[PDB]
Every structure is written in C-alpha cells, then in structure tokens.
C-alpha cells in the first residue's frame, strides 16, 4: 500500500481525463453509460465521470522516482 | 594627497589637437607675456581683491 498522495482528483487530472476519454469516443470506442439522445463526444465523456465509469488509471510520479496507480473510480471528484 | 592639500586646486586647460592637459600659465607664456605682473593683470582686473 503506502499511498502518501491525496485521495482527491486534482484540477489538472480532471481536465486531461475528460479530454482523452472524449477523443476515444470520437474514434468509435464503446461507451459505458446509457445515454439518451446525446451526440457531442465531450458531453458524453462528462456524464461518464459523474457515474465513476471511465476505464483509465492515473500514474502519479513522486519526485524520488517512485509512483503509484489510482483508478479514477477510487478518487473523490473535486467538482 | 599629503602634497597638494596645502596649495589647493590648479587651473588646467584642455586645448584641441593635443593629448595632455596643460596648466594655464604655460599657455599664457606661449603667447609672450612671460612676466607674472603682466599675466596677472589679464586675469585679475583690480588688485584690491
């Protein structure tokens, strides 16, 4: 274990996760929510975050060379 | 300086087309007027001062 970092998804990781997941949807990736008449590839990627169902892992690099991997499901969404 | 502290400041001149500074009494004598009673009447106009 020994996770020394914060359990809150910071401001910058939320802006990069939403950008990458939106670009994957535009290239025909399978979605993971029951959308209703939604078409914008960035509006969908935002309601996947509200449902904690984005399949991406974040690797935080400590300044001594180590790292640890947090699943986006495990983080407390700031907003 | 422990030398000119007593005498004081010296009037100098920097003529054109020459490298070094020149004292004024020298350039006065180069026009004639070698005596020091004749030089000091072109520069001081009344000897009650």
């Amino acid at each position: 274990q020994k996770r020394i970092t914060t359990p809150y998804m910071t401001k910058y990781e939320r802006a990069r996760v939403l950008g990458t997941r939106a670009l994957q949807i535009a290239m025909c990736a399978p979605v993971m929510v029951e959308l209703e008449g939604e078409t914008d590839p960035l509006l969908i990627a935002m309601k996947e975050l509200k449902a904690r169902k984005i399949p991406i892992i974040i690797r935080r690099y400590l300044p001594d060379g180590s790292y640890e991997d947090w699943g986006v499901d495990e983080l407390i969404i700031s907003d | 300086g422990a030398k000119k502290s007593a005498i004081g400041q010296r009037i100098v001149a920097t003529l054109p087309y020459i490298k070094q500074e020149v004292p004024i009494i020298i350039v006065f004598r180069a026009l004639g007027f070698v005596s020091d009673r004749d030089i000091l009447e072109h520069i001081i106009y009344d000897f009650e001062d």
Partner: protein
C-alpha cells in the same frame, strides 16, 4: 525569467527544477491563496478580566444556567464532577493559546487571513434550522468540547504517525485551531449563538468539507504565478516619490530590491533609544550629537599663520596676556623655539551646541597626532576662543612653512572630533503613528502604545552604532541588505527583504497576498548567498546547457559542453 520552473510536487513540497527543496509546504501552510479571507481572532486584544468574563462558563449560578439551557441538562451539569472538570480544562487550553498569540502578533492587530469563514457559517446554520434565540437550547456542552476535538483531528496537512511528522502537522494548523477553539467555545455557543443539537452536526460536517478543498493542488506552476503577482503591482508603484526628508519608494526602490546592487540612493539606518533617553529630549539630543560626525572646520571661525620668533614678541596686540601667564610657567623649551606660529579662532556657537570646549580638543589634537605640536589656549570666560600652536622645536636641530600649511589644511578636514566617520546628518523626531511606537502589554493585559524618540541617519555603518551605549541593540536596523548580510547573517536578510517588499507594496494602500512574498524571498536566498535576479546571477547555477544557450552566450558555453 528567474523563477520559471518552481511547482508543487505530488507530496506537497515546493521543489525546484533539479528537485532542490524550497519549502517543506507551500506558503508554510499548504493552502491555495484563492479560498481564504479575512477574519478576527477576538482573543488577543481584550483585557485579563473581560477575557475571563466572556470565555469562562461558570456553572454555579443555577438561574442564568436555568435561563440558557433546558431543565434536562441543567440538573446534569450541576451534578457531575467529571463534566465540571472537563469544562475547566478547556479554559486552560485557551489561556495558553492566548499567551502564544501575544508573542506571534506583538503589535496587537487582529486581521488575519484564514480558511473557511466561521461567523458566516454560524449565521447560515442559524437560519437553515429556524433557530429562535429566545428559548433555552438543548446543546450539551461536553458535546461541543468533544465534537470540536474530533473535528480538529480530521484536518490533516501533513499525514504521518511518527514524530517529526506528527509535530509539523501541529505546526501547520496551529493558528486555525486556535481560532476554531476560541470561536466555538462552550460559553459563547450557549450564550450568543444558541445553536441546537441538530444544527451543530451540520456545522461540524461543513467546516471539514470546506477546509479539505482549500489545500493546494499538486501540479500548479506556483513559481510563474508568484512572479506576475508582484510585477503588476510594480506598475502601480509611483515613479519618483518626492511628494511625501528623503526616502526611496516605488519601482526604483523595487529594482534596488530586485538586484542587491551595492548603491542604494539613500542608505539610512533607523535607530531606537533604550533608556529614559527615549523619553526626554535632552539625553536624546546629547546622544544625537555624540553619534554625528563633526570635523574641525565646522567649529573654527578663522585661522592665521603669524611669525613670532620669540614667544614674548606677540605680533597681534592682545594675546600677550594669556601667553605670558603661560610664559611665567615656561615649559618645553627643549631644543629651540619655532619662529613659526599657527593661530586658530573658534566659534562658541558651534562649540557649545555639541557640548565641546577646547580642553578635550587640546588633548586630542595632541594625543592622536603625536607630540610634534604644542597647544596653549585661553580661558573660555574670554569671549573669543583662541588657541595657538607651534611645532616641536626638536625638529630644528623641507621647509617648515609649507609643512605648517600642509598640517593646517590637513587637520581641519581629518579632525575626527566625535561620532562615526561615515554617518553625516542625524535627525530626531517622535512619531504619532502606531508603526514606530513602543507597544507594551500592561499588567492588566491591554495593548498600550507609547511615543518614543527615534533617530534616523544618512549613511550606514551599523556594526559600530550597535556597539554604543544607551542604543537599543535589538530593534536598530538599516535599509541596506548587504550590510545586514555581512553583519547579521542570512536569515536576517530573508526577513529584511520581506519587510521592505511589504513596505513598498503597501505604500499606496494596495495589498498582495503573503505566499507570493514568501516564495520570492525564499527562492532568492536559497543557495546560501545573495544572488541577484540579474544577468550574471542565474548564470552560475546547476542548470542545463540548453538553457544558458537561450541567453546571449550560446556558442561558447555549448562549445565548452
């Protein structure tokens, strides 16, 4: 261009580009300068009686306790020694913090910047639940105490269990916990606020949730953010502040702080006075004259080189009396008597203003130059103060006339009567503001300000001014920072630079947050010595080759590489 790559790393430390730690926590607290605001302490300013009157919660009245609490709790508070004991220790934990605040904030102000507002959060909870401040409440006090404890436990800035990581946490959230304990005490929240039981858990749950989102975010480019936060208030700075004696402020003072160039346009050390000399103007003026530099040509009227081949000749008419009454006591006729004389006249106006008379002059013009000179003098009852000097005749058994003129032209400028050589003019005044006053804490515990004489000079040599008597060696300082670097150290440079930045920023009533000043004056004095933010300041660091090629010496340093 200096501070481009400083940022917050994922363990909450503010590191450089080569991972050189700059701060163990951002802004020494760990919070972003975006979700904070002004509040009041309300514990340091009151007196020792009003304090114990407003923060005590006595429990032996039986009728006011009946007025504020319900009947269920008023019989339990009066009939339990454990409760009465636990209500007695919170006051002790409060008095200690009251005593710590008085040394953190010595001046006595109460306006601080902190996380989530507390009075507004109490006002909100007083209306989400329709609190009627007219009836007895149902909030048991030992619930308030233990709830505040448990809340204080869940506010971690430095998460760890071992010491040196369990005391830095107590150092980080030291002020906020004091504020939280003084605002949510048991007396106040049963007397003024009168919150219910339901309305207290809400407040506790909201404090924590609006604190945890004030912590800084791991990755924000803190360095560049603090470099334009100070530069744009440099635009509001006045160009040359002549409308205000002489002080340098504005953007020229800023770039006198930007670099640490040896030449401030008006170096000046402000001085404060320790004894009753700080009170009465006469001792202040005497130490004033004792500090100021005074040469000889300031106390002389005119001088004349006479010719006495014999001391009885006395060419000038009236000096024969005193020179003669010396002459019937004739000493030092060892080798000859020099026919060349030097006569000096003095101005008692300039003499007495410095409390000088020609006795001390007479010994020091001898003791200090040699014994080649010999001074006889008048008595000051005579209106004009003259003293005559001859060379020591041991030299007469290079002309002596030109030598005597050299000595005459040399002593009136190299006299060194009193004071320190470099400080030229020293003023005197007592301020009216609370900036330079002497604030004391009286016996009853109130902040009282006192007017005291201070002195300000034009010229700096502090190591000697500090060593003198009846001059406060603690509070005396100078506005030049290389001098403090050589004299006081490196941390003193840090704090003095911070103070001068604050004073130049807050000159026209403006305001800039503290984290930016702290970060700047910390990255500016990090490698031990004072490196200016200049051309050849960032040139000598542990930086890569491809950054020094972006600055005007690409090819030579890259050939070296």
């Amino acid at each position: 261009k200096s501070m481009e790559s400083v940022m917050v790393k994922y363990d909450a430390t503010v590191r450089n580009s080569i991972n050189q730690v700059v701060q163990l926590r951002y802004g020494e607290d760990g919070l972003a300068g975006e979700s904070v605001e002004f509040q009041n302490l309300a514990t340091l300013k009151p007196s020792n009686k009003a304090f114990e009157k407003k923060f005590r919660f006595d429990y032996t009245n039986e009728r006011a306790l009946r007025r504020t609490l319900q009947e269920d709790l008023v019989k339990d508070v009066l009939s339990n020694a454990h409760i009465q004991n636990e209500l007695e220790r919170e006051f002790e934990r409060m008095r200690e913090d009251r005593e710590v605040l008085r040394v953190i904030f010595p001046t006595g102000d109460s306006k601080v910047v902190l996380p989530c507002n507390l009075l507004r959060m109490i006002w909100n909870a007083q209306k989400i639940f329709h609190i009627n401040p007219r009836l007895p409440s149902d909030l048991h006090p030992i619930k308030v105490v233990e709830g505040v404890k448990e809340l204080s436990k869940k506010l971690v800035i430095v998460n760890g269990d071992d010491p040196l990581s369990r005391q830095a946490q107590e150092n980080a959230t030291l002020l906020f916990n004091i504020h939280l304990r003084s605002t949510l005490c048991s007396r106040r929240m049963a007397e003024e606020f009168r919150l219910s039981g339901e309305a207290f858990d809400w407040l506790l749950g909201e404090i924590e949730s609006k604190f945890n989102q004030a912590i800084a975010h791991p990755g924000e480019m803190v360095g560049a953010l603090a470099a334009q936060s100070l530069g744009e208030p440099a635009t509001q700075m006045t160009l040359n502040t002549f409308h205000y004696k002489n002080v340098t402020l504005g953007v020229p003072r800023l770039k006198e702080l930007i670099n640490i160039s040896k030449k401030p346009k008006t170096p000046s050390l402000t001085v404060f006075l320790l004894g009753q000399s700080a009170r009465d103007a006469e001792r202040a003026k005497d130490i004033l004259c004792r500090l100021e530099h005074t040469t000889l040509r300031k106390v002389t009227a005119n001088t004349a080189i006479y010719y006495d081949p014999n001391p009885q000749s006395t060419v000038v008419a009236e000096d024969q009396e005193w020179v003669n009454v010396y002459y019937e006591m004739p000493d030092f006729d060892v080798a000859r008597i020099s026919p060349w004389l030097l006569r000096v006249e003095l101005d008692r106006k300039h003499m007495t203003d410095r409390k000088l008379t020609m006795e001390q002059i007479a010994e020091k013009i001898n003791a200090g130059f040699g014994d080649d000179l010999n001074c006889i003098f008048n008595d000051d009852n005579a209106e004009k103060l003259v003293l005559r000097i001859r060379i020591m005749n041991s030299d007469e058994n290079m002309d002596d006339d030109v030598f005597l003129r050299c000595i005459e032209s040399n002593m009136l400028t190299d006299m060194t009567l009193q004071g320190i050589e470099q400080i030229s003019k020293v003023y005197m005044h007592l301020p009216q503001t609370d900036n330079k006053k002497k604030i004391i804490i009286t016996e009853d515990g109130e902040f009282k300000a006192l007017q005291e004489w201070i002195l300000e000079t034009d010229g700096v040599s502090l190591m000697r001014v500090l060593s003198e008597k009846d001059v406060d060696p603690v509070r005396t300082t100078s506005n030049d920072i290389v001098e403090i670097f050589t004299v006081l150290g490196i941390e003193a440079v840090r704090k003095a630079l911070e103070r001068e930045l604050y004073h130049v920023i807050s000159f026209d009533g403006s305001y800039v947050n503290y984290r930016h000043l702290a970060l700047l004056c910390d990255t500016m004095t990090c490698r031990g010595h004072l490196m200016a933010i200049t051309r050849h300041g960032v040139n000598r660091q542990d930086t890569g080759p491809l950054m020094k090629c972006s600055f005007e010496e690409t090819v030579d340093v890259l050939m070296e590489a």
